[PDB]
Swiss-Prot record:
Residues at the catalytic site: 139
Protein name, entry field: Serine/threonine-protein kinase PknA
One GO cellular component term: cytosol
Modified residues (Phosphoserine): 8, 44, 73, 103, 186, 251
Lineage: Bacteria, Bacillati, Actinomycetota, Actinomycetes, Mycobacteriales
Name of the gene encoding the protein in the UniProt record: pknA
Effect caused by changing residue 168 to A: Loss of auto- and transphosphorylation activity
Length: 277
């Protein structure tokens, strides 16, 4: 089995945390330091392609070099052989002590305006660090937005494998669903979807299947937000849910600045003009 396997003679896997399309996330013990960490073990299929392993190493190095409280640190990364499974790429990261936003939203339903706006600004600020560094999260969803006991937001599970090539569809950006490469603006869109849910109590798009919800992200415009909400909060979310990524806030920073303005009582600032590349 996978349990008990010490990757590179250092990371001993113990318990399964998450399961996804890119691979599995395991709770492992670091032989070297003794600390418990989170290890994302990628599938053997991606590892077999040489073009992937090159781009993964490059994206992992830049993500690890990131130092910000709002981001769950990436400690290490590499490749380890397992008997019968072959050479597979892994990623080592911070084992965050907190509650994920999806859990919070299941209990609370609809967050208070003060709290919803606070986490949006925090997530934006944290994303900007990655965006400035040339990285894109690619998987912004409440599951990856962790809330510490103090109240600080920590972003987990960066889309590193998506960089090297239902729950995914519920927050997917239109350009992502269409097959185009993600950009910081895609994270802004997905955080808008998170915002819409946090402020209204319901997601903008639903369906029987994932393909149905993903198509709603491409074609269907978002349903109007509750009338009892302030117009400024309503506008801020509607701006980020625009299908054309050029018409949204370039990155997390400009979005966070906009959230701050709404918190002050001002209309959300207009996104800067798109320069011609």
């Amino acid at each position: 089995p996978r349990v008990g396997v010490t990757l590179s003679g250092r990371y001993r896997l113990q318990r399964l945390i998450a399961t996804g399309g890119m691979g599995q996330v395991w709770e492992a013990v670091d032989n070297r330091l003794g600390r418990r960490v989170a290890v994302k073990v990628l599938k053997s299929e991606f590892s077999s392609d040489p073009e992937f392993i090159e781009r993964f190493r490059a994206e992992a190095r830049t993500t690890a070099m990131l130092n910000h409280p709002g981001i769950a640190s990436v400690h290490d990364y590499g490749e380890s052989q397992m008997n019968g499974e072959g050479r597979t790429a892994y990623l080592v990261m911070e084992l965050v002590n907190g509650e994920p936003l999806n859990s919070v939203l299941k209990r609370t339903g609809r967050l208070s305006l003060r709290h919803a706006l606070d986490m949006l600004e925090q997530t934006g600020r944290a994303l900007q660090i990655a965006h400035a560094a040339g990285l894109v999260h690619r998987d912004v969803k409440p599951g990856n937005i962790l809330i510490t006991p103090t109240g600080q937001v920590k972003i987990t599970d960066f889309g590193i494998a998506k960089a090297v090539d239902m729950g995914t569809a519920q927050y997917i950006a239109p350009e992502q669903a269409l097959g185009h490469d993600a950009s910081p603006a895609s994270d802004v869109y997905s955080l808008g979807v998170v915002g819409y849910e946090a402020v209204s109590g319901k997601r903008p798009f639903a369906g029987d299947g994932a393909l149905t919800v993903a198509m709603k992200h491409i074609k269907e415009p978002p349903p109007p937000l509750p009338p009892d909400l302030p117009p400024n909060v309503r506008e801020l979310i509607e701006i980020t849910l625009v299908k054309n990524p050029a018409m949204r806030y370039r990155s997390g920073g400009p979005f966070a600045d906009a959230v701050a303005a709404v918190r002050a009582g001002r209309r959300p600032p207009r996104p800067s003009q798109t320069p011609p590349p």
